[PDB]
From Swiss-Prot, chain A:
PANTHER family attached to this UniProt entry: 40S RIBOSOMAL PROTEIN S11 FAMILY MEMBER, SMALL RIBOSOMAL SUBUNIT PROTEIN US17M
Gene Ontology CC terms: cytosolic small ribosomal subunit
Protein's name according to its UniProt entry: Small ribosomal subunit protein uS17
Coiled coil start-end: none
Entry similarity comment: Belongs to the universal ribosomal protein uS17 family.
InterPro entries per record: NA-bd_OB-fold (IPR012340), Ribosomal_uS17 (IPR000266), Ribosomal_uS17_bact/chlr (IPR019984), Ribosomal_uS17_CS (IPR019979)
Gene Ontology biological process: translation
HAMAP family in alphabetical order: Ribosomal_uS17_B
Swiss-Prot record, chain B:
InterPro entries documented for this protein: Ribosomal_bS16, Ribosomal_bS16_dom_sf
Protein name as catalogued: Small ribosomal subunit protein bS16
A Gene Ontology biological process term: translation
Keyword Ribosomal protein: yes
Annotated GO CC locations: cytoplasm; small ribosomal subunit
Annotated S-S bridges: none
An example Gene Ontology molecular-function term: structural constituent of ribosome
Source taxon at top rank: Bacteria
Family classification: Belongs to the bacterial ribosomal protein bS16 family.
UniProt keywords, alphabetically: Ribonucleoprotein, Ribosomal protein
Taxonomy of the source species: Bacteria, Bacillati, Bacillota, Bacilli, Bacillales
tRNA-binding as UniProt keyword: no
UniProtKB/Swiss-Prot annotation, chain C:
Organism lineage string: Bacteria, Bacillati, Bacillota, Bacilli, Bacillales
Part of the full-length chain shown: 70 to 136 of 137
Family membership noted in the UniProt record: Belongs to the universal ribosomal protein uS12 family.
Chain's gene name: rpsL
Assembly with partners or alone: Part of the 30S ribosomal subunit. Contacts proteins S8 and S17. May interact with IF1 in the 30S initiation complex.
Function: With S4 and S5 plays an important role in translational accuracy.
Location of 3-methylthioaspartic acid modifications: D33
Stretch list, region Disordered: 49-67
Name recorded for this polypeptide: Small ribosomal subunit protein uS12
Swiss-Prot record, chain D:
GO biological process: ribosomal small subunit biogenesis; translation
Molecular-function annotations in GO: rRNA binding; structural constituent of ribosome
Complex and partners: Part of the 30S ribosomal subunit. Contacts protein S5. The interaction surface between S4 and S5 is involved in control of translational fidelity.
The family this protein is said to belong to: Belongs to the universal ribosomal protein uS4 family.
The gene coding this protein: rpsD
SUPFAM superfamilies (UniProt xref): Alpha-L RNA-binding motif
UniProt protein name: Small ribosomal subunit protein uS4
The keyword DNA damage is annotated on this UniProt entry: no
Pfam families (UniProt xref): Ribosomal_S4, S4
UniProt superkingdom: Bacteria
UniProt keyword terms in alphabetical order: Ribonucleoprotein, Ribosomal protein, RNA-binding, rRNA-binding
Taxonomic source organism: Staphylococcus aureus (strain NCTC 8325 / PS 47)
Domain S4 RNA-binding positions: 91-154
A GO cellular component entry from the record: small ribosomal subunit
RNA sequence: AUGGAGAGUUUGAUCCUGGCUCAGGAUGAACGCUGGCGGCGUGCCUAAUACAUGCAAGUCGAGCGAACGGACGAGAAGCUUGCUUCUCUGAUGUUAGCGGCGGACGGGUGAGUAACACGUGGAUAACCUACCUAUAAGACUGGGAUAACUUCGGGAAACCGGAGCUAAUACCGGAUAAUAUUUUGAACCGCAUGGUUCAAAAGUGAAAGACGGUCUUGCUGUCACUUAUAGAUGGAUCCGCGCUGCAUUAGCUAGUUGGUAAGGUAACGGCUUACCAAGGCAACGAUGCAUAGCCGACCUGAGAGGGUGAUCGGCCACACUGGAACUGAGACACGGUCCAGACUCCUACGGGAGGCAGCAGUAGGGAAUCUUCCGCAAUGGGCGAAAGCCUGACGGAGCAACGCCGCGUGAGUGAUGAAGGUCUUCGGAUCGUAAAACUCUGUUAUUAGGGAAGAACAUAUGUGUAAGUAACUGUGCACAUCUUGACGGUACCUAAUCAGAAAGCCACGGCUAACUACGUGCCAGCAGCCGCGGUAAUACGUAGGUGGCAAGCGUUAUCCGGAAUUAUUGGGCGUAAAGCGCGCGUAGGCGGUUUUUUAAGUCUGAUGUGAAAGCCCACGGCUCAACCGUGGAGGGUCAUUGGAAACUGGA
């Protein structure tokens, strides 16, 4: 029933075995001056078969802890 | 043990109780689970009482046990009789 | 002071009974004429005596009501 | 009252008859003190606002703290702040009793209510600060129905404003409705007091 | 629309710039002078400094043996039939001890913590949960010990051992029971891992009795006990976002980052270990350093913002310092254990003991913060079937003008302008309707009477009704009755007596409301800024008068405002402070016109949530108000979901 968060982002490193780091990009607004400023967050996601490659836009979903800092699993490769 | 009890409010020499379902271990006047009514024993020379029958019955069925004063208040409101009848005829 | 800091404190009023080793109460407020005097000594507190012969604005100089 | 002072000197200072008769200003309409006579200085804007505020405050015989609090609560009402403040001051039990005429002076009415000779809706009220409201009745204590002062004031037939409906046979007054600016004293420019409390 | 004030001061004079200063609001305040009362709040902010003394966690005899105790009432007559022993019965009771439950709550504190600690929104198909509630099934059959107790020995004490004996709802074996574990098949489903249901088998342990009713030891009530599945409660973990200063801190990391295997945990996981690889973080501020409990809220401001994190509620963390585990559903445990450490105490010198950041209180520190008080009567909690016991939680009282709110210190008449003070132009002016005097009142105060509510109950005693019974006693519910107050004879009410007991503080040159006389003579002294004082001082001190406040008034300290004086709202850089001496150029910021498309920003609707208290609005109750209570409104940069395509972003 209850679903888990899903994010879309680019792959920025895959040197780790079966792990890819996904950079999700957002734009937080400055609290006083109100300007739009870029905000990047890197997500460590599980890539069982090493399908994803450095550069492709992939999709990840939140899971239980899988490692010291892995909390996401690769769902599909939206683009490449 | 979940319980239905009186949490004190008002002022010195002027108590006013709220009727609350709260864990027994929580402080009096502290954390509660859910309020169901109010009980003023110094109003118009007759204790003013307000209770939500639906919530009272739900908590009685769940297992919350009133205290002495709350049991008397629910008896006066007739909630105890309805709970007993439902339990007997379930 | 009780915090071991050494300051200069003005003695307000006319005439005072203060000497070395007197224990005094010090409040803020500098004396514009006096360069390094940045505090005032309260009158009528601890050792410091009230101003003798003061009758107007006594509370400012720690003088009891004569009556 | 709380301010137990020379009401004549206060009237002379503020250039207003706090009693309403004018006796204080009849002979010496100038300020008290050594420099009273031959006084010709001109008040500043702050001085004028302060004088207006003091006129109203000493007219109603209140202390500064209570006056300020009443002004604050009046400001929260819908309408014109100054008019609301004036009507709220009028609604005080002191003012209602004095207008009904159970005493010849505002301070006398204050002492009456303080000593409990008055009843609102048939119940004792010792606090002159009490804020009367429309639809209520002011009576007199039975043990004090035959007081010389109250009976003499009732005999002296004073004008009863429109917002008060009085019957001297029963010594019973009724607060019919809220007053109006015209009914309330016109010697006060409430805008000056509003600005005074603005700064 | 509910909402926004300025002034002094640079000059001979001016405009500008510019800082400094003042008028407002606030406080857990302190101090000086003064001080009548009531109501409601608040009261060690410093030394997470050390602590004398008392108290702050017990309860259960209806789980258990034992001991003490001895009714009701036996026997001989001491010829005392009212006093008596043991040969009895021995009930109502009490207890040290075993056992159960509670000591993980309640209360204190903010040291540590810059971190998923906290706030907000989510997730767990990675989780645990005593007591409570519901349902279903059970509670069968045996056994060995031990405390207490008696005895012997050693101790100043703490208390220790050896021997012997005895209980249980204490402990243990076996029997039957599984949705738990292993294997096989089948059905369906989802967010990878996987989840739900059914059918087969194999391994497989649970439990307890106590007090009563009916008495047929058969049935049976209440409580208690065991297994399973749900509910409720409570706890755990993970994640997005938010949440602080410094670059005169630029590199950090080696179980570190990932994978494999195993171990470990309620649980997933480098959580730990072994192996392989060299990964991981960081100018979107890593690391380091400093400081800090976070929030609801609180102060201020027109707002935007700025400051704060007392009292009250939530969350966290800690319990002399450090480490550890035990028991337990739950702790790595404030008034538990062990070890180490510092410190302190007692001792017969052999050896022992302790942890107020619980409530009071002591010492100390400090400008500064209270009683070694009363009661469990109310609310809440633990134990008990219950009466009841415990409860420094809590409910009260005591102290402190510490704050807010309310009421006093009198009211009417009173020219005859009385005396007297001060000034004077020597006529008078002023204190002044002030006073005197006559009349009035008793809020307050003194005296004497009456006197609440807060109290619901629980239990006990009567009935009625409902499930079950073969039928009672009981159990749930309903209606009645006796009894229950620390505060306290307090609040409040009544009657009598007296204006009699109850006004002080600051200021008066401008800002800024309020002026004169004496003394002084750049002295004494004042001062927030500008300044004042050398003989005519409204600025120093006193006096009269006046102004502002008033049981308070001033001073000091700190915060916001005024300050558009860090300027998003809302400022600037020719000469006032401010354009790098100038190129070339990286990251970043920003970017010409049209068409199609996307929906990240942007706009709009629905749902959930943003606790309670608080602020604001309304209403109701204290005689009013503060205060209290009840509704409403508000507060997200919040999340999920459905819509639009102009602009920014992407194609
Ligand atoms: Mg700290
Ligand atoms: Mg502003
Ligand atoms: Mg403990
Ligand atoms: Mg302790
Ligand atoms: Mg203490
Ligand atoms: Mg000291
Ligand atoms: Mg500003
Ligand atoms: Mg220049
Ligand atoms: Mg240049
Ligand atoms: Mg709320």
């Amino acid at each position: 029933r209850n679903d888990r968060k899903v994010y879309v982002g680019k792959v920025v490193s895959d040197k780790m075995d079966k792990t890819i780091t996904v950079l999700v990009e957002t734009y937080k607004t400055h609290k006083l001056y109100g300007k739009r400023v870029k905000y990047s967050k890197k997500y460590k996601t599980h890539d069982e078969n090493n399908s994803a490659k450095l550069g492709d836009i992939v999709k990840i979903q939140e899971t239980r802890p899988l490692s010291a800092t892995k909390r996401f699993r690769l769902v599909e490769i939206v683009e490449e | 043990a979940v319980k239905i009890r009186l949490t004190r409010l008002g002022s010195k020499r002027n108590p006013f109780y709220r009727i609350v379902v709260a864990d027994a271990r929580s402080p009096r006047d502290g954390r509660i689970i859910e309020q169901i009514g109010t009980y003023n024993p110094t109003s118009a020379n007759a204790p003013e009482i307000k209770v939500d029958e639906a919530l009272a019955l739900k908590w009685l069925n769940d297992g919350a046990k009133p205290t002495d004063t709350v049991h008397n208040i629910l008896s006066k409101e007739g909630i105890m009789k309805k709970f007993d009848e439902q339990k007997k005829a379930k | 002071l009780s915090n071991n800091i050494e300051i200069n404190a003005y003695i307000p009023g006319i005439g005072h009974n203060l000497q070395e080793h007197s224990v005094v109460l010090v409040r803020g407020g500098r004396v514009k004429d006096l360069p390094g005097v940045r505090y005032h000594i309260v009158r009528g507190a601890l050792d410091t005596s009230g101003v003798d012969g003061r009758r107007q604005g006594r509370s400012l100089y720690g003088t009891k009501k004569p009556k | 009252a709380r301010f137990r002072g020379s009401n004549w000197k206060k009237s002379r200072r503020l250039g207003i008859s706090l009693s309403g008769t004018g006796k204080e200003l009849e002979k010496r309409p100038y300020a008290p003190g050594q420099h009273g006579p031959n006084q010709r200085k001109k008040l500043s804007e702050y001085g004028l606002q302060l004088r207006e505020k003091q006129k109203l405050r000493y007219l109603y015989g209140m202390t500064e703290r209570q006056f300020r609090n009443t002004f604050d609560i009046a400001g929260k009402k819908f309408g014109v702040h100054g008019e609301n403040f004036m009507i709220l001051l009028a609604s005080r039990l002191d003012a209602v009793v004095y207008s009904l005429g159970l005493a010849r002076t505002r301070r006398q009415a204050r002492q009456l209510v303080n000593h409990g000779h008055i009843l609102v809706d048939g119940k004792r009220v010792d606090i002159p600060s009490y804020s009367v409201k429309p639809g209520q009745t002011i009576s007199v204590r039975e043990k004090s129905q035959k007081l010389n002062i109250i009976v003499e004031s009732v005999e002296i037939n004073n004008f009863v404003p429109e917002y008060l409906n009085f019957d001297a046979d029963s010594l019973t007054g009724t607060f019919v409705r809220l007053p109006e600016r015209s009914e309330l004293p016109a010697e006060i420019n409430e805008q000056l007091i509003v600005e005074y409390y603005s700064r």
